[PDB]
């Protein structure tokens, strides 16, 4: 018949190909389609939803709800820092089990801006102001409010609106970053300091808490599928 030649790559099974194939049930009538609410079309829709961050991950609090809330109180505590952590959305213990982190750990690269939302959960008679600061890489983490104020920061005043947003913008040399980060693709850190302190009247509890939420912006993207290192089995039937 027609003369042909076989090129390399013949009779191989490549797991990520896509060819047509014969159907084992010819002329099958499928069930009609139903309009179910909540149809997903892109995983980047899931990463754009907030989720609580476990910032207080120390010994004795890994299996309690205490892992989610950041303590704060009244008096003179200006020399003390509130919290601080590294911006590694897919490698740091603080971020890797959130929605954003679980989506990232399926990919190798990422890029775009991030949002950290903060909510104050004291009584309605408490007042205070906080400084939230981001520092691009290239130096050690700041050790005083004076050092932290030199980066990208915002001053948040507690009132009726209970929430504030610290947007972390994209400032990098490359277009993407590794999800398994190293010295070469660092992203910086985030710290928090008292700006004026917490003042309360008589008859209230002493301590108050702050909570953190993390999500992605509308210019975020990922690429290069891989496997996730979190689930694992030893045998079949599991």
């Amino acid at each position: 018949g027609l003369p042909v030649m076989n090129t390399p790559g013949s009779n191989q099974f490549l797991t990520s190909d896509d060819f047509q194939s014969p159907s084992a049930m010819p002329q099958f009538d499928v069930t009609p389609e139903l309009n179910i609410p909540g149809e997903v079309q892109n995983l980047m829709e899931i990463a754009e939803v907030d989720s609580v961050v476990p910032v207080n991950n120390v010994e004795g609090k890994l299996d309690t709800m205490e892992i989610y809330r950041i303590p704060v109180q009244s008096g003179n505590h200006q020399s003390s820092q509130v919290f601080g952590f590294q911006v590694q959305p897919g490698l740091d213990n603080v971020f890797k089990h959130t929605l954003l982190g679980e989506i990232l750990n399926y990919y190798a690269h990422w890029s775009g801006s991030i949002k950290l939302t903060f909510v104050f959960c004291g009584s309605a008679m408490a007042t205070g102001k906080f400084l939230l600061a981001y520092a691009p890489p290239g130096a050690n983490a700041p050790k005083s409010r004076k050092d932290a104020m030199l980066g990208t920061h915002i001053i948040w005043d507690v009132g009726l609106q209970s929430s504030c947003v610290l947007c972390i913008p994209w400032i990098s040399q490359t277009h993407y970053r590794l999800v398994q980060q190293d010295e070469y693709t660092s992203a910086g850190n985030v710290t928090c300091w008292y700006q004026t302190g917490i003042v309360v009247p008589a008859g209230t509890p002493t301590s108050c808490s702050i909570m953190c939420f993390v999500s992605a912006c509308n210019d975020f993207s990922v690429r290069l599928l891989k496997d996730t290192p979190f689930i694992e089995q030893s045998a079949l039937l599991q």
């Binding site: 179910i36 989720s51 929605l99 959960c121 008859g203």
Partner: protein
């Protein structure tokens, strides 16, 4: 802008400290259409005798309370004509309006999460075991989470950090949800349509969704305030439909 009123049937709810209303996936409850049905007989639609606000029984928020959950339906199977229609039909369908109320003074503090989870399948405490229906639901009485790992027998793995489902609780915001921060609002409202892979289903055999209420920040006060703070839930069916009339079931 924080006042709100909802009327259904001969029921009305008012509020003066409202946040907003969440509509689950941007879609409102509706009736089944002709080009997506499968059952052939004419359905019944009571329409004011069932679409109505029913009030469950309250729970007591304490210093150390893990949380509570209810299963829907089967929490409403004894509420008047909605439950009566439930006993006499084979298929039913309805959406819901959920309203949670909890108020406190300006000298208290706390924060609750109110979340509706579709098909919240739960796991037993003995890993090679099975669950009961009694340890899954109790009607209008709530089931209580636990602060530590449960051992028990036949009981759900109730520790609150895993939500009885093997996940992390801080990730439950992927579902339709609201917060009650005791310094901002005192009520939460969710409107949830009918969600299933079939157009209608039996209301006894299948738990459509679960309502979970979890305190993230515990309750706190100081030395003169009221120590008793209750939480109350109120549910209203919407666009209810029933098919397959026959004699009444038993249990």
């Amino acid at each position: 802008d924080r006042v709100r009123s909802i009327t259904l049937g001969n029921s009305t709810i008012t509020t003066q400290e409202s946040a907003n209303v969440v509509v689950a996936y941007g879609r409102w409850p509706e009736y089944l259409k002709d080009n997506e049905a499968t059952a052939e007989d004419q359905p019944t639609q009571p329409d004011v005798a069932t679409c109505r606000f029913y009030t469950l029984e309250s729970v007591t928020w304490e210093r150390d309370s893990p949380g509570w959950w209810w299963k829907f339906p089967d929490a409403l199977k004894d509420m008047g004509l909605f439950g009566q229609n439930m006993y006499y039909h084979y298929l039913g369908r309805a959406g819901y309006t959920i309203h949670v109320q909890c108020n406190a003074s300006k000298f208290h503090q706390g924060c609750l999460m109110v979340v509706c989870v579709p098909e919240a399948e739960m796991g037993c405490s003995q890993v090679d075991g099975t669950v009961n229906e009694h340890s899954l639901s109790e009607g209008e009485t709530a089931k209580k989470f636990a602060s530590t790992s449960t051992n028990g027998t036949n009981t759900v793995q109730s520790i609150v950090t895993n939500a009885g489902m093997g996940v992390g609780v801080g990730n439950l915001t992927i579902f339709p949800h609201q917060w009650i921060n005791l310094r901002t609002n005192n009520c939460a409202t969710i409107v949830m349509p009918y969600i299933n892979n079939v157009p209608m289903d039996n209301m006894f055999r299948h738990h459509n969704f679960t309502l979970m209420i979890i305190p993230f920040v515990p309750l706190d006060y100081s030395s003169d305030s009221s120590t008793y703070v209750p939480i109350t839930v109120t549910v209203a069916p919407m666009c209810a439909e029933y098919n397959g009339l026959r004699l009444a079931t038993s249990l």
